[PDB]
Amino acid sequence: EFVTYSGEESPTRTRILSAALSPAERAIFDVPIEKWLSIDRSSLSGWKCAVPRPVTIEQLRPVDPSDAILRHIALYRGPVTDLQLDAIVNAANTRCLGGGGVDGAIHRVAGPLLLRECATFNGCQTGECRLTKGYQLPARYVLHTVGPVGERPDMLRKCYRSILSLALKNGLRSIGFCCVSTGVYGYPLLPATRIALGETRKFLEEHGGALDMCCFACFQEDEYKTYEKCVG
Numbered sequence: 001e002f003v004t005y006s007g008e009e010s011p012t013r014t015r016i017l018s019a020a021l022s023p024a025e026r027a028i029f030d031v032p033i034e035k036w037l038s039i040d041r042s043s044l045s046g047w048k049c050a051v052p053r054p055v056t057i058e059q060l061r062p063v064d065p066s067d068a069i070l071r072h073i074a075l076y077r078g079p080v081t082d083l084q085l086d087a088i089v090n091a092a093n094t095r096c097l098g099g100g101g102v103d104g105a106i107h108r109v110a111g112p113l114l115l116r117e118c119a120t121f122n123g124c125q126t127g128e129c130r131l132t133k134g135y136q137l138p139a140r141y142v143l144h145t146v147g148p149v150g151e152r153p154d155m156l157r158k159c160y161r162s163i164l165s166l167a168l169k170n171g172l173r174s175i176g177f178c179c180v181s182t183g184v185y186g187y188p189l190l191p192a193t194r195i196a197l198g199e200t201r202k203f204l205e206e207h208g209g210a211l212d213m214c215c216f217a218c219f220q221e222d223e224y225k226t227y228e229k230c231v232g
């Protein structure tokens with residue numbers, strides 16, 4: 001049985017949950033979260049993938065095929081939504097019912113059932129992670145994390161730990177990351193990238209064999225260059 005939250009445990013939520021759903025939408029929503037990993041989603045008549053040519057694990061290139069650690073890390077030029085991995089990361093807020101930035105894009109692509117699922121829990125604390133189905137994303141699951149506002153390294157680190165912990169607890173083998181806290185939350189990019197990479201490296205060293213790919217999705221060229229520069 002899945003661990004769906006890393007931490008310890010509304011009229012808007014009420015409105016969302018009372019909104020009409022079709023039988024076909026109900027059928028997708030009814031899929032036990034743990035079954036979604038392996039289900040043939042095309043067997044559900046209400047499902048589709050909303051990303052036409054998703055980028056799969058075998059299409060990514062590791063930073064370095066020969067390093068023990070960097071063979072499990074890839075950089076990707078583009079939105080995290082393109083990635084067909086076990087899980088993608090959303091940079092949410094504590095309410096965790098959508099927003100702008102990557103949170104907006106993920107909800108657009110995933111479709112309205114993602115926000116419906118989010119309304120079943122009481123948001124998400126800073127540094128923690130909530131696990132939901134990915135609905136219309138090529139990715140299976142979303143790991144919604146809430147990064148700090150401003151440079152609070154231990155919370156940003158916590159975010160990365162919480163994400164990687166839930167993937168480990170539930171047997172997710174590949175994760176697509178976005179640059180959490182670095183857009184509207186204004187965490188400085190190079191310091192944020194250091195943490196993202198430092199934490200993923202530490203996790204990979206301790207839990208080698210649990211994960212096959214940590215892909216860092218760089219929606220902006222300067223994120224991609226910062227990541228590139230950080231990994232030699």
Ligand SMILES: Nc1ncnc2c1ncn2[C@@H]1O[C@H](COP(=O)(O)OP(=O)(O)OC[C@H]2O[C@H](O)[C@H](O)[C@@H]2O)[C@@H](O)[C@H]1O
Pocket residue numbers: 079080081091092093098099100101102103104105147178179180181182183184185186217218219220223
């Ligand atoms: N349209 C997009 N598509 C894909 N990736 C994007 C997009 N826009 C930004 N990114 C990338 O997404 C990454 C994260 O930037 P941010 O989304 O700002 O998140 P945060 O943690 O700093 O701010 C969170 C708040 O913003 C939201 O309103 C939430 O609801 C929160 O309230 C960067 O790589 C961006 O380039």
